[PDB]
Amino acid sequence: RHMTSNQKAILAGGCFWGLQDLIRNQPGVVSTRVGYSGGNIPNATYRNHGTHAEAVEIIFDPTVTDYRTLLEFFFQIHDPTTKDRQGNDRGTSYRSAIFYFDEQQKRIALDTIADVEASGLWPGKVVTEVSPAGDFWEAEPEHQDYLQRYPNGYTCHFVRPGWRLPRR
């Protein structure tokens, strides 16, 4: 409806509790929710989500932050070099993915991955999936805002200050 309408991203990078808890406090992030996306079956749940990834849908204000900045933070908080695993969480549920809503997001995602790789600062090849966004199945209430409600809960996400691009 206008040039600076809020924009949306869906990112997957492991256990969704940790990904949400870090992203939610980023500048320009208006709202977040966790869920299941990128897979096959409809009406996905924690117990039954097939090939879906645990993911975070992010609504953001493009005059306060931008898609590139959010992706740079994403690559700073999860290890994007492990296939179908994040830390000790193993399986396709935990894979690294960027689900793009438009061609610009696709291009920015690929450009960001190229810069990450060229930096040599990350531990290996980036294995992040870049795929068009589809259905996003909102997770159950108990998984929403989990580390806000239970701050000593499990997480293996954290900021790596050295996983940073000085320039693009």
Q: Of the candidates 8, 157, 140, which has an alpha carbon nearest to the alpha carbon of residue 94?
A: 157
* Residue 83, CA atoms < 13 Å, CB-side half-sphere: 2
d(CA 94, CA 29): 23
State the CB neighbour count (10 A cutoff) for residue 2: 4
Any catalytic annotation for residue 156? no
**Residue 13: CATH number of its domain:** 3.30.1060.10
* Structural Rg of the chain based on CA atoms: 15
Q: What angle do CA 125, 130, 136 make, to 5 degrees?
A: 130
The answer to whether 95 and 39 are in contact (CB under 8 A) is: no
The answer to whether 78 and 157 are in contact (CB under 8 A) is: yes
Per the DSSP assignment, residues forming a β-bridge with 33 are: 57
- Angle between helix axes 67-77 and 16-23 (nearest 10 degrees) is 130
The answer to whether 64 and 27 are in contact (CB under 8 A) is: yes
Q: Which two tokens stand for residue 13?
A: 């990078």
Phi then psi dihedrals of residue 98, to 5 deg: -120, 120
Tell me which residue range forms the domain holding 73.
Answer: 1-168
Torsion of the alpha carbons at 92, 98, 99 and 104, rounded to the nearest 10: -160
The answer to whether 53 and 95 are in contact (CB under 8 A) is: yes
Q: Which amino acid is at 140?
A: E
How are beta strands 129-132 and 96-100 bridged, if at all?
Answer: parallel
State the CB neighbour count (10 A cutoff) for residue 122: 17
Per annotation, catalytic residue among 9, 11, 15, 29: 15
Q: Of the candidates 19, 93, 23, which has an alpha carbon nearest to the alpha carbon of residue 59?
A: 23
* Data resolution in angstroms: 1.5
- The number of domains in the chain is 1
The answer to whether 129 and 38 are in contact (CB under 8 A) is: yes
d(CA 7, CA 90): 31
Scan for tokens 């996983």, then name that residue: 163
d(CA 119, CA 125): 11
Q: Of the candidates 69, 90, 65, 74, which has an alpha carbon nearest to the alpha carbon of residue 129?
A: 74
The total number of residues shown for the chain amounts to 168
